[PDB]
Paper text:
Hemoglobin (Hb) and myoglobin (Mb) are the key molecules in animal aerobic exercise, as they are responsible for molecular oxygen (O2) transport in the bloodstream and its storage in the skeletal muscle, respectively. In the present study, we investigated the molecular evolution of whale Mb by experimentally resurrecting ancient proteins. The atomic structures of the synthesized aMbWp, aMbWb’, aMbWb, and swMb were determined by X-ray crystallography to 2.4, 1.6, 1.4, and 0.8 Å resolutions, respectively.
The aMbWb and aMbWb’ proteins are the common ancestors of the toothed (Odontoceti) and baleen (Mysticeti) whales, which would be closely related to the early whale Basilosaurus27. Thus, under the currently dominating monophyly hypothesis, aMbWb’ is positioned between aMbWp and aMbWb, and therefore regarded as a pseudo-ancestor in this study. From aMbWp to aMbWb’, V13I filled a cavity in the hydrophobic core, T34K added a hydrogen bond, and K118R (interacting with another substitution, E27D) introduced an electrostatic interaction on the molecular surface. However, the resistance to the precipitant (β) significantly increased during the evolution from aMbWp to aMbWb’, slightly increased from aMbWb’ to aMbWb, and remained almost unchanged from aMbWb to swMb. The analyses also revealed that the adaptation via the ZMb-increase strategy reached a plateau at the last common ancestor of whales (aMbWb’ or aMbWb).
Author numbering: 0 to 153
Write the structure that this text describes.
C-alpha cells in the first residue's frame, strides 16, 4: 500500500497548492461531501439548515471546519506514511467519540480529489491523480484498521 518517494513528491507538490488557501479548499471539500452524501451532513446538527451550495459557501463556520480537516490531513500527508502519531488521536475521536462510519472517509477522499481537479486542472495531471489516490487509500486503510482495533465496526 506504500508510495515511492516520487509518488510522495507528487502528493506534496499538489498539496502545496492546497496550502495557499487551506480553509477555502477545505470548505469546498465539505461542500462536495455534504452535497454528494447528505448523510454526512446529518452528523453536524449545527449545519442542518445549510441546503444549497451558496448557503454552504456563505458559512464561515463551515469554512473553519474545512480548515480543521485539511490542516489535520496535511499534517498526515507530510509524514509520507509515517503518520502513527497524527493518526492515533484522529482515529480515536472519529471511531469512539464522533462514531463516523468508515465509508465516509472514502466519500471525503473522493471530495478532496474533486476539489483538486476543480482548482488545479493544469497542475493535477494523471501522475499526481494516481499518487494522491494512493496516499488517500493508505490513510483510509490505516484509519480503518485502527477503527477495528478500537472496537468500532461502523
Ligand atoms: C480526512 C478526513 C477527516 C479529517 C482529517 C478530520 C479531522 C477532524 C479534526 C481535526 C477534528 C477536531 C478534533 C477531533 O475531534 O478529532 C474533527 C472533528 C469532527 N469530525 Fe472530522 N475529520 C475527517 C473526516 C470526517 C468525516 C467524513 C465526518 C463526518 C461525516 C467527520 C465528523 C467530525 C465531527 C462530528 C467532529 C466533531 C465536530 C465538532 O464538535 O466540532 N470528520 N475532524
Amino acid at each position: 500500500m506504500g508510495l515511492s518517494d516520487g509518488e510522495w513528491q507528487l502528493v506534496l507538490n499538489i498539496w502545496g497548492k492546497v496550502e495557499a488557501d487551506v480553509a477555502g479548499h477545505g470548505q469546498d471539500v465539505l461542500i462536495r461531501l455534504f452535497k454528494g452524501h447528505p448523510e454526512t451532513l446529518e452528523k453536524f446538527d449545527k449545519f442542518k439548515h445549510l441546503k444549497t451550495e451558496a448557503e454552504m459557501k456563505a458559512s464561515e463556520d463551515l469554512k473553519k471546519h474545512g480548515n480543521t480537516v485539511l490542516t489535520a490531513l496535511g499534517g498526515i500527508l507530510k509524514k509520507k506514511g509515517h503518520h502513527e502519531a497524527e493518526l492515533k488521536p484522529l482515529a480515536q475521536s472519529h471511531a469512539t467519540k464522533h462514531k463516523i462510519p468508515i465509508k465516509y472517509l472514502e466519500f471525503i477522499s473522493d471530495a478532496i480529489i474533486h476539489v483538486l481537479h476543480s482548482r488545479h486542472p493544469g497542475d493535477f495531471g494523471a501522475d499526481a491523480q494516481g499518487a494522491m489516490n494512493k496516499a488517500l487509500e493508505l490513510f483510509r486503510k490505516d484509519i480503518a484498521a485502527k477503527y477495528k482495533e478500537l472496537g468500532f465496526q461502523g
